Design a protein around this nucleic acid. Structure first.
Ligand SMILES: O=c1ccn([C@H]2C[C@H](O)[C@@H](COP(=O)(O)OP(=O)(O)OP(=O)(O)O)O2)c(=O)[nH]1
Ligand SMILES: [Mg+2]
Ligand SMILES: [Mg+2]
Ligand SMILES: [Zn+2]
Ligand SMILES: [Zn+2]
Lengths: 196, 133, 559, 49, 85, 159, 263, 65, 112, 43, 141, 114
RNA sequence: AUCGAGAGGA
C-alpha cells in the first residue's frame, strides 16, 4: 500500500535491466498503473510523490500536514529549481530496446507499505485428507489440510450451466458419499445388513 | 496496370484537424471545373501549404508479401514525391451525372468527385495514390 | 443449508490471483505445487500407457507425475513410500492418480458466485510462482481485481464430468451472455487504453516495429501487408496492423456524432472484411458493447475463433503499448491559469444567486411551488443552483484539458474515469449530502460550532468550494467526511440486502426449466409460460435489430 | 516506547475497549410512530452514580 | 407403454447441447475404459476426442429417451438426430 | 411530458402533453373522474392495479415496475427473465411475494421448501399431513445425492 | 579504426563519461544490459555462523555480507563451483573469508568489512579484498556490538553474475541518452504552455546542433551517437566494466556461432 | 537497524557513509542536503537511502543481555 | 400450430420488411444464387437460435436480475436536488416489489 | 497498538453516521468497513 | 492560568470557535490563486479558538500525507491498512515471546510527514519504505 | 517457494540445447529459431542487425512469456540465400563491430589522465 | 479434537 488506500499486489518482478530507466540511470523499485488513479481521486498520492522528490533532492523535511499553506504550485517551483520538469515527469527509455518512450513518466519516491497477507500463507490445495467425525465431510481450514466450501450459491451456478453429473459428483465422490440399506416395506434404515 | 486517373489540383485549404502528423486537404483541378478532392496527407513527410498546385494520379501496379525496396535495380510508377496505397469503399452518386469515390489508406481518407472517372475506378481493393511537386 | 445444499469438497484449491497478458483467454495459470497436489484418476489404456508408465516413474515429487496407483482388487499403492515405486508394471484397466497437466478442464470460481459466469471451465497451464494467473478479459464475468482477491478451483474426477465442463462451462462459450443478449467480456485497462492510442490517424509505425508486431500474432499468415505510405519512407498505420488481428469475413458499421463516411473527426467505425476503414477503435467498438466487434466475431465465426481474438488484440496492443509508454501525473489535474479564474468567478455567481434567493426568502417574498413547503422550495432552489455551479465549473475544466492530457485520454478511451472525476479533481468537489439533504444542523441551529445560528449559506451546509487539487478546508474536510461515511454505510447495507434478494429469487425459481415441448414448467408440472420467453428463443442468440416497417412517413414507406 | 494502558492475564496482554452507552438522568422527548396512540413521550433513565 | 410411435413425435429433430455433452461424456467413459472403437483413429489418443470423431460420423449406438411433463417419452437414435448446433 | 405520436403524414412526431402527478393512491375513484383518459391512467402500486383491473393488468404493471428499477439505474436485462419472474409471482391467481410467505407456502416438495426457510416446522407439518415428496425438485436430488433432472440429466441414455 | 567510435569526456576510478558514435541503438543498449547484468564478479555466497550473540539475526547479517564488494580483478582465472571438479569448493574456485570481533570496550564496538580476513590460498592473484573506498580506511559497517557480544563466522566468496543475484553486479548506475533535442521525434513532450521553456535542456545540448524550426522533419535520420556514463561499484575498475562488457557480449554472440556448428 | 549496504534502487554502496554523515551533521554543523552532496550522493535514490534511514540498532544495543 | 404462428409473428415482420421485392432488387442487389443461400442461412441460424430443452431458466433468470442488482448505487438518488422527486428507486424499491409490500413509501397516480 | 488502545465500541436511530458533534472528539476517518462500520470508533 | 480550557459536546453547544488565530481575526484592510478558498471572519464574537484543525483526526488518519486532497472514503481505507503494515512494533522485540512477530529489515521514516507523527513515534518506529515509484503501463503485468 | 531457481535464466537444463531451428510452415524460405536462456540482450541485437542485410525479407523476435528465458527469432530471406547463413553473417558482423568498439575504447582510455 | 468469542481478508 501507499497511504491513500491504493492497495494491490505484485504481478511480476523485472530485473534492473528490463525496467524503464531515466537518463541519469535511475530505475523504479515499483511500477503502478496510471489506471488506478483517476476514478479513486487520490490526488494526495500524486502530491506526496511530487513533494517527496523535492525532499530527497534538497535534503529537507517533506511537510504534508493537512491544513497548511503548501501547494502543488509551490512544490513545483522548488522542484524546477533542482532541475527537473516541475510536474514530476521525466523522459524514460524502454529497457528492452534502449528506445526512448514516446510518453513521459510520472516518477518520484513514494512511501509504500508492506502489509500482512503474503501468498504462501494462503495457497491451499486439497485432494482428499482428514474428514470430520460427525458428517464424514472434509475438515475445515487450510491450517488443518481441509476442503473448500462448494456452497449452495455455487451449486446454483452449476444448475444454470446444466452440469448435472459434475454437481452430483462434487456432492458424492468428493466430500460425502455413503451406501445404506433400505427396507422395501417400511422405507427406513432399519435393515440390519449382515453383509459378507 | 497502368494509370486510372489524372489531374493537377490547386489546394484551396489546409486544416490540421486536432492532429500533428496529418492534415485534411481541400483541392480542385484547374483544368476541369466540376471536379474536387478532399484528402488526408502525412504533413510531416510531404508538407503542403495553401495554394500548392499538386499533381495527382491513381494506379494498381508499379499480392504476395511486400518486400523492402532494395532498389539497387528497381522501378515503380514513382517519378513522384508522396505515394500511398489503399482500398475503395464507397462509390457514391451525387445524382443526375455527378459521381464521387471514397478511398482509405489505412485510415488516411480520400474523396474524389467528377464524372469522367467513368469506366475506371472499379470495386478494386487496389488503387495507389501518387502526388508530385 | 450447511451440509447438503452445500458442503466442503475434495480436489479444490485456492490462492491470490494475478493478471497475465501472455496467457490465453480460456487458460488459467496454476501454481506448480498445487498442480502436484491435485490429481486425476486415469484408466490404463494402450493409448496412454507410454505417458502413464513414464508418469508413475516420475513419482509424486517431480512435476508431471503421480501419486497412488490403483489396481483391481481395490488396493492402493503409495508412490511416495512403498518399495516398488521405481518398479511397477501397469496393467490395462488399472487407475493412475496422475498430476494435473497442461490443458486439463478445470472449474474456476470467484465468490460471491451469482451468475453462471462466476463459474467457468478453464484450460490448465502449470506455472512457477504461487498465484493463479488469468487473462484480464475474464476479469469481469468473475468481477475480480488483483488487489488481493482470491479464487477457488475444483477438479473434475470423472470422464463425462470433464466432458460436461469443456462442452457446457468452457470460457469461450460463455462469452456472449443470456443475461443481456450481449458479450460479457471485452478489452479493458491497458489494452483498451492503448488500442485507442494505437489507432489514431497520427499513429504510424515503421518497418522494424511492424515486423515484431506481425510476428506477435500467432495466427499470422506470414504476409507483410503493403504499407499505407510507400512515399519517402514505408510507414504503416496503427489501424493497418491491428487489422491483422481481426479475422476474415468480418463486417462492422457504426456512426456516432458527426459521422459522414468521411469521419472528419475519425469517429464512428467501419470495418470491411478483416480491415478497418475509418474510426478510432475504443470501448463502443471493442468493449463488451451490444453491436460490437466481440458480439459479431463470436456470432459469425464461433466462440473458439472469438476467444483467440482477445489473445491477439492484446498481444499486439500490449506490445505496441510497452514501447510507447503511458502515464498519468498530477500535472494532468492542473487547469489553466485563465480557466481557474473562470471556475472561480463561476462559483461566485452561484454564490450571489443563492444569496439573493435567501435574501428573498428572509423577506417573505418567496412563493411556494405547488404542493411543497416554503422552506422545501428554498432548499430545492439552492441545491440546484449549486449543482449547476459544480457541473458548469467541471465542464469549464474539461473543455480546457488538451488531448495530450493523460486523464482525458483514459476517459476518451473508456478505460477509466468520468466527467465527475475531472470535475472533482480540478474544478470543484461540490455539495455534500446526507440523508438526501444538504448538511444537517447537528448542533442546535448550526452544523458546526464555528458558525453562527440560522446560517443557511453554501459553505455553512456542505458546499466545498475547493477541488481535490486545491485541498479541502477544515470545515469542508469534515462535511465531506460525513458524506463519505454515508456512502460506506449503505455499501455495507446494499451487499447485505442484495445478497438476500438473490437467494430468495434463486430459491423461488430454482426448478423452473424448459421442457421437451418448449413449455416452461416447474417440479409440479405447472405451466408458467407456454413458450419460453414468449417466443421459444434462447436469450444469447438474440440481437437488437431495427424494424423497418415502423417509422417514417407513409410516403417514404411506399416509395 | 511502550505506552502501557493494557493488562496482562496469563502472559497475554489485554486491552479493555471503551463502551458507548446513552447517558442517564437526562430528559428527552420523542415524537412517536404514526400507527400508535401515543403522540409524544418524555423519557428519563435515572440511576445512582 | 407408455411410449410414443416413431410417428407423431413433436420434439426437435436436433440434438441439444445437453444431449450431446452427455453422449460424448458417456462414450468418453467407455473408450477410456478400453471398450472397443468404431472409427479410424487418425492418431487420436484422447478418449473424448475419439468420442467426438465417432459422433461426427454417427457411429455411436446410443438412444435418447426424451421425457415429457406428462410422463410419456420419445426415443431418438444418435444416428437420426441432427448435430448442427 | 414528451410524447411521440403519428403525424397526419405517417412519421412519429414530438407532441407534448400535460400529465398530472399524484402523492397517494385512490385508483377506482380518480379514473371515473370527468375530463381524463381512463384508458391510460397508471399507478406504481401494482397491488392496486391488480385489484381494479384484474390479474393480467397486474402482471403487466408489476413487470413495468421491476423493469423500471433496472433501466432507471442504467442497466439492461433481457425481457425473458423479468417476464419469467413476473409470471411466477402471478400464475397462482394474485400476487405471491418472493418470501417465506409467498412462494415457499406453495405445495412443492417438502424437502425443497424446507431448504429455504423455517426449516424444521416445514418438516413437522410434513410428517403430520403425511406429505408425498415428488423428488423432481432440483434440491431434493441435491439432498439425496442423485443426478438432478437438469440439463444433462433431463433425459435418459440407452442402447 | 574501423568501427563504432568512442570518446571520453571524464574519467575517475569510479566513473567514465563518453560519447559513443557510429553505433546501432540496439547495440548501445545491449551493451548496457550486459554491463549491468552479465559480467562475472566475486562475492560472498555462503556464510557459516559459529557465534552470533548480536542484536541482528543470522541471515540478516549473512545478507549484508553478500552485498559487500570484493576485489574481482583477476576473476577470469577462477572457476564456477558448478564447473570445478572439487567436491564443494577449493582455492581454484572460491575464496574463504573469516570474521571475528568481540565486544571489548564500554563504548559500542563497530564491525567493518576491513575486519574480514582472507584464509584461502590466493595463489597470488587479485581476488577477494573487501573494496574500501572509505576515507578513514574501514569500508562498510556490517554490524555493531555492545559489551559482551560476539560474532564469529566464515564466508566463501564465489564467481557469479547479476542475473543470479544482484549482489554480483559491478554496475551501479549507467546514464544513457540519445538525441538531446528530439530531432528524431522519438518522444512527445507533455506540456501546459510551451515545451522548451517547461523542459530543462540536458547537459548534452552543447554537443549537438540546434534543431532549427525552418527545416522539415528529417525522416531518414537514425538513433546514432549516445551519451553514456558508467559508474563502478568497486569490484572492477570502471574501464574494465565497459571492457568486459563489450567482451562478454562478444563472447555470448560467439557461443551461438559455435552452437550453429555442432548441431 | 543499521545502514543498508548498497542503495536498493541503484546499487551504489552507501553502507560505509553512515558514520561520515553523522559527523558532517554534528561536527561541521552541515545540512542534510549539502551533507549528502559532499558524500557523493547525487542521484536522489541514493540520497533517500541515507536521509530516510533510521538507526534502531542503537536502541537494540541498549538492552543489557 | 396456432401457438407456432404466434411465436414467430414478430420475426416475420422483420423478415418481410427486409426480404421484400423492391428492396431485394434495388437496395441490396441479390442474384438467384445468393438469394437461396440467404434463405438457407436464415433457416439454419433460426433453428440454432431456439432454446434447448433442458435449460434451467429458473435459476438463469434469478441470477440475471440479482446480479445487476448488486451493482446498483444511490439508494437515495441524484433526483435529490428536488425534495419531492423522491420516488423510491434502486434496491429499497426492489425490496418493496419482491415483497408485495402493502405500505409503500411513494404511492403515485399518473393521470393522462 | 496506539490505535487499538483508543477504541470505542457501541452495542446493538442513526448510530453509524458521523454526527456533527463528533467534531474534534472522534476521528472522522478511522472506522472499519462493512459489518460494524461507524459503530466502532477511535478517539 | 486560564489560557486553555476543556469542553464537551454539550458545552460546545454554546460557544463560537475560531479555526486559526490569524486567518480568523486580524481585522480588515492581492490573493494567491493556488491556495484553497477561505470561508470568512463573518462572526466576530469568539469565545474559543481551535488549537489546531488537524487534531480532529485519530492516530491512524494522522499518518496520511495531505488527507485534505483525498476523497474521504479512501482515507478510511488507509486507516484500515496502516494497522496491517509491517514495521517494528517494539524495540525489545528480540526479547519477547509471542505468536507472530513481523519486523521490517530496513524501516524508513517517510519523506513526506505530518506534524502529528512527531507525537506518534512514527519516524522513530516507521513502517514503510521510500520506494522509487513510476506510474506507467509497462509490460501490462 | 513456488519460485523457479535463479540459475535457470542462464544455465541450460539437461537435454535443452541453445538453439533449435524450425522450418516455417507459413511462408517459403523462412525459419524459426528458439534460443534457450537468452533475452532482449541478444534477441534485439541480432534482429536489428539481421535487418541491415538487404537479402533479408523478414526478421523479428519475441519473448513469449517473461517467466522463461527462451525467445523466438523468425527469419525469411531471398531465394538462394539460406536463413542460417543470414544469421551467421549477422553474428560475425556484430562481433567485428565489438572488437572495434573495444580497441577504440582502450585507446581512448589510455590517453586519459586521472 | 469440539463449543463459543473476538480480530481480519476479498
Ligand atoms: O462501470 C464501472 C464501475 C466501477 N469501476 C471501478 C471504478 C473504481 O476503480 C472501482 C470502484 O468501485 P467499488 O468501490 O465498488 O469497487 P472497487 O473499487 O473495485 O473495490 P473492491 O474490489 O474492493 O470492491 O470500480 C469500473 O471500472 N467500471
Ligand atoms: Mg474495480
Ligand atoms: Mg479485490
Ligand atoms: Zn573448486
Ligand atoms: Zn541510488
Amino acid at each position: 500500500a501507499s497511504r491513500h488506500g491504493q492497495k494491490g499486489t505484485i504481478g511480476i518482478t523485472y530485473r534492473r535491466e528490463d525496467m524503464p530507466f531515466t537518463a541519469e540511470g535511475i530505475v523504479p523499485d515499483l511500477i503502478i498503473n496510471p489506471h488506478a488513479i483517476p476514478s479513486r481521486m487520490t490526488v494526495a498520492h500524486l502530491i506526496e510523490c511530487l513533494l517527496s522528490k523535492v525532499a530527497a533532492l534538497s535534503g529537507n523535511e517533506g511537510d504534508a500536514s493537512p491544513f497548511t499553506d503548501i501547494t502543488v504550485e509551490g512544490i513545483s517551483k522548488l522542484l524546477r529549481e533542482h532541475g527537473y520538469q516541475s510536474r514530476g515527469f521525466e523522459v524514460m527509455y524502454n529497457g528492452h530496446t534502449g528506445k526512448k518512450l514516446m510518453a513521459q513518466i510520472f516518477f518520484g519516491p513514494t512511501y509504500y507499505q508492506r502489509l500482512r497477507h503474503m501468498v504462501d500463507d494462503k495457497i491451499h490445495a486439497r485432494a482428499r485428507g482428514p474428514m470430520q467425525v460427525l458428517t464424514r465431510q472434509p475438515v475445515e481450514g487450510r491450517s488443518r489440510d481441509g476442503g473448500l466450501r462448494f456452497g449452495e450459491m455455487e451449486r446454483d451456478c452449476m444448475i444454470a450451466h446444466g452440469a448435472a453429473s459434475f454437481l452430483k459428483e462434487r456432492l458424492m465422490e468428493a466430500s460425502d458419499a455413503f451406501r445404506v440399506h433400505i427396507c422395501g416395506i417400511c422405507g427406513l434404515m432399519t435393515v440390519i445388513a449382515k453383509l459378507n | 496496370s497502368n494509370t486510372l486517373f489524372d489531374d493537377i489540383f490547386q489546394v484551396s485549404e489546409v486544416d490540421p484537424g486536432r492532429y500533428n502528423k496529418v492534415c485534411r486537404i481541400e483541392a480542385a483541378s484547374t483544368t476541369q471545373d466540376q471536379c474536387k478532392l478532399t484528402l488526408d496527407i502525412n504533413v510531416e513527410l510531404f508538407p503542403v501549404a495553401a495554394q500548392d498546385s499538386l499533381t495527382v494520379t491513381i494506379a494498381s501496379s508499379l499480392t504476395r508479401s511486400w518486400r523492402p525496396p532494395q532498389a539497387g535495380d528497381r522501378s515503380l510508377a514513382d517519378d513522384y514525391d508522396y505515394v500511398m496505397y489503399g482500398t475503395a469503399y464507397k462509390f457514391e452518386e451525387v445524382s443526375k451525372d455527378l459521381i464521387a469515390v471514397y478511398y482509405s489508406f489505412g485510415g488516411l481518407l480520400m474523396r474524389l468527385e467528377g464524372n469522367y472517372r467513368n469506366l475506371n475506378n472499379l470495386k478494386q481493393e487496389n488503387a495507389y495514390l501518387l502526388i508530385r511537386r | 443449508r450447511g451440509n447438503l445444499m452445500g458442503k466442503r469438497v475434495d480436489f479444490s484449491a485456492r490462492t491470490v490471483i494475478s493478471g497475465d497478458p501472455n496467457l490465453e483467454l480460456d487458460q488459467v495459470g496454476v501454481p506448480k505445487s498445487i498442480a502436484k497436489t491435485l490429481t486425476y484418476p486415469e484408466v490404463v489404456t494402450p493409448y496412454n500407457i507410454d505417458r502413464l508408465t513414464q508418469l508413475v516413474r516420475n513419482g509424486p515429487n517431480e512435476h508431471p507425475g503421480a501419486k497412488y496407483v490403483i489396481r483391481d482388487s481395490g488396493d492402493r499403492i503409495d508412490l511416495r513410500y512403498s518399495k516398488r515405486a521405481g518398479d511397477i508394471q501397469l496393467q490395462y484397466g488399472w487407475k493412475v492418480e496422475r498430476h494435473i497437466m497442461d490443458n486439463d478442464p478445470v472449474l474456476f470460481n470467484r465468490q460471491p458466485s451469482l451468475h453462471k459466469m462466476s463459474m467457468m471451465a478453464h484450460r490448465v497451464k502449470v506455472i512457477p510462482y504461487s498465484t493463479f494467473r488469468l487473462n484480464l478479459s475474464v476479469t469481469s464475468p468473475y468481477n475480480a481485481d488483483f488487489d488481493g482477491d482470491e479464487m477457488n478451483l475444483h477438479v473434475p474426477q470423472s470422464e463425462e464430468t470433464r466432458a460436461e465442463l469443456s462442452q457446457l462451462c468452457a470460457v469461450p462459450l460463455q462469452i456472449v451472455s443470456p443475461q443481456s443478449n450481449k458479450p460479457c467480456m471485452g478489452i479493458v485497462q491497458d489494452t483498451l487504453c492503448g488500442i485507442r492510442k494505437l489507432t489514431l490517424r497520427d499513429t504510424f509505425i515503421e518497418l522494424d516495429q511492424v515486423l515484431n508486431m506481425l510476428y506477435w500474432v500467432p495466427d499470422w499468415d506470414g504476409v507483410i501487408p503493403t504499407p499505407a505510405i510507400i512515399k519517402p519512407k514505408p510507414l504503416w498505420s496503427g489501424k493497418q496492423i491491428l487489422s491483422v488481428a481481426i479475422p476474415n469475413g468480418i463486417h462492422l458499421q457504426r456512426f456516432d456524432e458527426g459521422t459522414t463516411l468521411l469521419s472528419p473527426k475519425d469517429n464512428g467505425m467501419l470495418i470491411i472484411d478483416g480491415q478497418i476503414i475509418f474510426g478510432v477503435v475504443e470501448k463502443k467498438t471493442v468493449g463488451s458493447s451490444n453491436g460490437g466487434l466481440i458480439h459479431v466475431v463470436t456470432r459469425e465465426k464461433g466462440p473458439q475463433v472469438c476467444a483467440k481474438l482477445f489473445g491477439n488484440i492484446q498481444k499486439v496492443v500490449n506490445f505496441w503499448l510497452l514501447h510507447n509508454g503511458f502515464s498519468t501525473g498530477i500535472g494532468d489535474t492542473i487547469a489553466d491559469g485563465p480557466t481557474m479564474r473562470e471556475i472561480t468567478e463561476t462559483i461566485a455567481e452561484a454564490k450571489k444567486k443563492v444569496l439573493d434567493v435567501t435574501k428573498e426568502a428572509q423577506a417573505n417574498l418567496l412563493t411556494a411551488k405547488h404542493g411543497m413547503t416554503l422552506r422545501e422550495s428554498f432548499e430545492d432552489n439552492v441545491v440546484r443552483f449549486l449543482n449547476e455551479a459544480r457541473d458548469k465549473a467541471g465542464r469549464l475544466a474539461e473543455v480546457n484539458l488538451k488531448d495530450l492530457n493523460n486523464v482525458k485520454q483514459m476517459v476518451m478511451a473508456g478505460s477509466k474515469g468520468s466527467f465527475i472525476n475531472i470535475a472533482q479533481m480540478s474544478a470543484c468537489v461540490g455539495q455534500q449530502s446526507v440523508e438526501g439533504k444538504r448538511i444537517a444542523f447537528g448542533f442546535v441551529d448550526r452544523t458546526l460550532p464555528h458558525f453562527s445560528k440560522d446560517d443557511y449559506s453554501p459553505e455553512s451546509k456542505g458546499f466545498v468550494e475547493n477541488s481535490y487539487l486545491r485541498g479541502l478546508t477544515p470545515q469542508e474536510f469534515f462535511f465531506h467526511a460525513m458524506g463519505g461515511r454515508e456512502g460506506l454505510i449503505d455499501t455495507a447495507v446494499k451487499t447485505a440486502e442484495t445478497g438476500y434478494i438473490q437467494r430468495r429469487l434463486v430459491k423461488a425459481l430454482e426448478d423452473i426449466m424448459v421442457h421437451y415441448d418448449n413449455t416452461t414448467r416447474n417440479s409440479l408440472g405447472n405451466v408458467i409460460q407456454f413458450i419460453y420467453g414468449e417466443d421459444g428463443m434462447d436469450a444469447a442468440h438474440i440481437e437488437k435489430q431495427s424494424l423497418d416497417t415502423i417509422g417514417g412517413s407513409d410516403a417514404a414507406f411506399e416509395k | 516506547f511502550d505506552m502501557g494502558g493494557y493488562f496482562i492475564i496469563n502472559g497475554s496482554e489485554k486491552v479493555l475497549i471503551a463502551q458507548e452507552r446513552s447517558a442517564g438522568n437526562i430528559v428527552q422527548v420523542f415524537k412517536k410512530a404514526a400507527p400508535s396512540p401515543i403522540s409524544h413521550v418524555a423519557e428519563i433513565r435515572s440511576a445512582l452514580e | 407403454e407408455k411410449a410414443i410411435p416413431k410417428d407423431q413425435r413433436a420434439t426437435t429433430p436436433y440434438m441439444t447441447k445437453y444431449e450431446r455433452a452427455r453422449i460424448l461424456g458417456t462414450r468418453a467413459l467407455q473408450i477410456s475404459m478400453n471398450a472397443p472403437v468404431f472409427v479410424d483413429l487418425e492418431g487420436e489418443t484422447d478418449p473424448l476426442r475419439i468420442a467426438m470423431k465417432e459422433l461426427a460420423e454417427k457411429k455411436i449406438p446410443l438412444v435418447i429417451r426424451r421425457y415429457l411433463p406428462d410422463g410419456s417419452f420419445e426415443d431418438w437414435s444418435v444416428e437420426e438426430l441432427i448435430v448442427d448446433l | 411530458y414528451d410524447r411521440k405520436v403519428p403525424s397526419p403524414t405517417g412519421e412519429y412526431v414530438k407532441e407534448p402533453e400535460w400529465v398530472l402527478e399524484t402523492d397517494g393512491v385512490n385508483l377506482s375513484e380518480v379514473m371515473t373522474v370527468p375530463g381524463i383518459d381512463p384508458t391510460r391512467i397508471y399507478t406504481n402500486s401494482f397491488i392496486d392495479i391488480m385489484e381494479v383491473l384484474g390479474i393480467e393488468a397486474g402482471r403487466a404493471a408489476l413487470y413495468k415496475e421491476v423493469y423500471n428499477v433496472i433501466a432507471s439505474d442504467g442497466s439492461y436485462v433481457n425481457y425473458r427473465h423479468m417476464a419469467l419472474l413476473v409470471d411466477v409471482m402471478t400464475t397462482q391467481g394474485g400476487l405471491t411475494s418472493v418470501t417465506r410467505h409467498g412462494f415457499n407456502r406453495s405445495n412443492t416438495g417438502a424437502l425443497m421448501r424446507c431448504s429455504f426457510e423455517e426449516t424444521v416446522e416445514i418438516l413437522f407439518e410434513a410428517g403430520a399431513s403425511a406429505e408425498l415428496d415428488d423428488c423432481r425438485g432440483v434440491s431434493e436430488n441435491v439432498i439425496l445425492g442423485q443426478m438432478a433432472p437438469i440439463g444433462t440429466g433431463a433425459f435418459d441414455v440407452m442402447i | 579504426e574501423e568501427g563504432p567510435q568512442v570518446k571520453i569526456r571524464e574519467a575517475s576510478k569510479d566513473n567514465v563519461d563518453f560519447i559513443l558514435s557510429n553505433v546501432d541503438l540496439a547495440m548501445a543498449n545491449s551493451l548496457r544490459r550486459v554491463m549491468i547484468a552479465e559480467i562475472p564478479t566475486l562475492a560472498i555466497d555462503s556464510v557459516e555462523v559459529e557465534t552470533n550473540t548480536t542484536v541482528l539475526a543470522d541471515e540478516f547479517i549473512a545478507h549484508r555480507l553478500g552485498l559487500i564488494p570484493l576485489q574481482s580483478m583477476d576473476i577470469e582465472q577462477l572457476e564456477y563451483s558448478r564447473d570445478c571438479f572439487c567436491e564443494d569448493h577449493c582455492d581454484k574456485c572460491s575464496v574463504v573469508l573469516t570474521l571475528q570481533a568481540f565486544g571489548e570496550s564500554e563504548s559500542t564496538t563497530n564491525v567493518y568489512s576491513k575486519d574480514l580476513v582472507i584464509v584461502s590460498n590466493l595463489m597470488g592473484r587479485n581476488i577477494g579484498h573487501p573494496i574500501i573506498q572509505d576515507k578513514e580506511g574501514n569500508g562498510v559497517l556490517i554490524c555493531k556490538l555492545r559489551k559482551g557480544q560476539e560474532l564469529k563466522l566464515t564466508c566463501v566468496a564465489k564467481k557469479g553474475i547479476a542475473k543470479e543475484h544482484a549482489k554480483w553486479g559491478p554496475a551501479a548506475a549507467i546514464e544513457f541518452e540519445y538525441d538531446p533535442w528530439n530531432k528524431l521525434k522519438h518522444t512527445d513532450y507533455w506540456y501546459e504552455q510551451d515545451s522548451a521553456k517547461e523542459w530543462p535542456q540536458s547537459k548534452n545540448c552543447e554537443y549537438e546542433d540546434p534543431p532549427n524550426e525552418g527545416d522539415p522533419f528529417d525522416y531518414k535520420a537514425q538513433a546514432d551517437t549516445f551519451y553514456m556514463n558508467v559508474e563502478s561499484v568497486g569490484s572492477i575498475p570502471v574501464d574494465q566494466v565497459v571492457v568486459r562488457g563489450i567482451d562478454t557480449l562478444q563472447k555470448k554472440v560467439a557461443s551461438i556461432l559455435l552452437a550453429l556448428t555442432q548441431m | 537497524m543499521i545502514v543498508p549496504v548498497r542503495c536498493f534502487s541503484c546499487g551504489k554502496v552507501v553502507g560505509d557513509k553512515w558514520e561520515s554523515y553523522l559527523n558532517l551533521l554534528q561536527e561541521d554543523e552541515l545540512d542534510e542536503g549539502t551533507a549528502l552532496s559532499r558524500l557523493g550522493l547525487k542521484r536522489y535514490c541514493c540520497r533517500r537511502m541515507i536521509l530516510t534511514h533510521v538507526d534502531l540498532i542503537e536502541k537494540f544495543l541498549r538492552y543489557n543481555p | 400450430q396456432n401457438a407456432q404462428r404466434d411465436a414467430v409473428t414478430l420475426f416475420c415482420c422483420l423478415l418481410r420488411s427486409r426480404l421484400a421485392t423492391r428492396r431485394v432488387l434495388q437496395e441490396y442487389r441479390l442474384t438467384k444464387q445468393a438469394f437461396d443461400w440467404v434463405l438457407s442461412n436464415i433457416e439454419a441460424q433460426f433453428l440454432r437460435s431456439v432454446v434447448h430443452p433442458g435449460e434451467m431458466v429458473g435459476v438463469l433468470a434469478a441470477q440475471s436480475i440479482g446480479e445487476p442488482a448488486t451493482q446498483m448505487t444511490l439508494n437515495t438518488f441524484h433526483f435529490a436536488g428536488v425534495a419531492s422527486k423522491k420516488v423510491t428507486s434502486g434496491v429499497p424499491r426492489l425490496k418493496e416489489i419482491l415483497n408485495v409490500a402493502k405500505n409503500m413509501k411513494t404511492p403515485s397516480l399518473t393521470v393522462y | 497498538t496506539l490505535s487499538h488502545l483508543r477504541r470505542t465500541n457501541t452495542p446493538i436511530a442513526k448510530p453509524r453516521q458521523l454526527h456533527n458533534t463528533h467534531w474534534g472528539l472522534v476521528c472522522p476517518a478511522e472506522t472499519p468497513e462493512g459489518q460494524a462500520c461507524g459503530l466502532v470508533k477511535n478517539l | 492560568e486560564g489560557l486553555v480550557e476543556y469542553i464537551d459536546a454539550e458545552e460546545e453547544e454554546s460557544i463560537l470557535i475560531a479555526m486559526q488565530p490569524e486567518d480568523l481575526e486580524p481585522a480588515e484592510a492581492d490573493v494567491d490563486p493556488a491556495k484553497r478558498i477561505r470561508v470568512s471572519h463573518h462572526a466576530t464574537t469568539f469565545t474559543h479558538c481551535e488549537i489546531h484543525p488537524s487534531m480532529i483526526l485519530g492516530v491512524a488518519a494522522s499518518i496520511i500525507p495531505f488527507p485534505d486532497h483525498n476523497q474521504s472514503p479512501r482515507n478510511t481505507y488507509q486507516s484500515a491498512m496502516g494497522k496491517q503494515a509491517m514495521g517494528v512494533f517494539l524495540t525489545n522485540y528480540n526479547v519477547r515471546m509471542d505468536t507472530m512477530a513481523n519486523i521490517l529489515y530496513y524501516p524508513q521514516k517517510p519523506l513526506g510527514t505530518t506534524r502529528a507523527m512527531e507525537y506518534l513515534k512514527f519516524r522513530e518506529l516507521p513502517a514503510g519504505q521510500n520506494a522509487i515509484v513510476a506510474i506507467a503501463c509497462y509490460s501490462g503485468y | 517457494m513456488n519460485a523457479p531457481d535463479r540459475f535457470e535464466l542462464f544455465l541450460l537444463g539437461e537435454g535443452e540445447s541453445k538453439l533449435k531451428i524450425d522450418p516455417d510452415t507459413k511462408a517459403p524460405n523462412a525459419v524459426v529459431i528458439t534460443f534457450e536462456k537468452e533475452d532482449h540482450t541478444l534477441g534485439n541485437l541480432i534482429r536489428a542487425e539481421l535487418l541491415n542485410d538487404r537479402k533479408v525479407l523478414f526478421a523479428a523476435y519475441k519473448v513469449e512469456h517473461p517467466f522463461f528465458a527462451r525467445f523466438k527469432l523468425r527469419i525469411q530471406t531471398t531465394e538462394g540465400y539460406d536463413p542460417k547463413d543470414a544469421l551467421k553473417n549477422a553474428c560475425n558482423s556484430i562481433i567485428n563491430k565489438l572488437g572495434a568498439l573495444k580497441t577504440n575504447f582502450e585507446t581512448e582510455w589510455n590517453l586519459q589522465t586521472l
